[PDB]
Design a protein around this ligand. Sequence first.
Ligand SMILES: C[C@@H](Oc1cc(-n2cnc3cc(OC4CCN(C)CC4)ccc32)ccc1C(N)=O)c1ccccc1C(F)(F)F
Ligand SMILES: [Cl-]
Ligand SMILES: [Cl-]
Ligand SMILES: [Cl-]
Ligand SMILES: [Cl-]
Length: 253
Amino acid sequence: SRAEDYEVLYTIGTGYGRCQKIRRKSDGKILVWKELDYGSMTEAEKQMLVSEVNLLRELKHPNIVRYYDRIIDRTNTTLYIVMEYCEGGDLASVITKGTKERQYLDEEFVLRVMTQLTLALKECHRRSHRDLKPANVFLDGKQNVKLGDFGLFVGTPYYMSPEQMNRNEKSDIWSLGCLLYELCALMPPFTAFSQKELAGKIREGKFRRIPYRYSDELNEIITRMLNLKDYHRPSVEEILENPLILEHHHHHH
Ligand SMILES: C[C@@H](Oc1cc(-n2cnc3cc(OC4CCN(C)CC4)ccc32)ccc1C(N)=O)c1ccccc1C(F)(F)F
Ligand SMILES: [Cl-]
Ligand SMILES: [Cl-]
Ligand SMILES: [Cl-]
Ligand SMILES: [Cl-]
């Protein structure tokens, strides 16, 4: 694991540090890395970074962004985390694009996201947290969908579940429902200017139907994930049993 084993193509994001698209010298494989400067970190914080990286390395699944390697450049006090390159980028940018272009996404694409994220979620629960939010969902070059490592103040918590408003794997189902709803409608199911107003809308549990281009069957399952009672939301298993979900909606190598 050395930095010289890879060549940077270009930077794809800056924030935490920066994310760059890179090329593995030995075989030409295209990857990315997260570049983190740990020079200002205490031993404690550096220690919580080690454990974190250890947690990233323990989850291997087709619908979870894959970790490849960790590289320490103790000279520039930089740590690189090497991960898979997702050519389609993140889902938040896809929604924004639809919103700005005034173009809804195909039902087929929504089903692929539902199927593959529900499988990612199933694997997360099996192990036991990674945020179910558009910015943390990635698309590769083969129609596959993968959950990233985000989560694993200023903002409105659009996706918080009713039971989290005050006090559960069913809560993850609510968040997935919010995500799929936003993918369809291009806006979250509950919106407001403050968290208090938001909590008011969430408690009432009312929202618009997703657009009419989407089947009553898809509207139905998203609506069930958004039930106020956690025990009326479908489990991972009940979601995957839905007649909408077919083999082609799953991942393929
Ligand atoms: C911080 C970063 O986090 C992740 C990034 C990726 N990731 C892997 N391949 C990527 C390709 C991306 O877009 C490329 C350039 C622009 N075009 C339009 C699309 C291809 C964007 C993110 C990608 C995977 C996992 C994570 C993670 N934290 O788990 C991130 C997160 C959300 C949006 C943007 C970024 C980035 F910093 F990479 F830009
Ligand atoms: Cl529109
Ligand atoms: Cl209602
Ligand atoms: Cl709404
Ligand atoms: Cl795959």
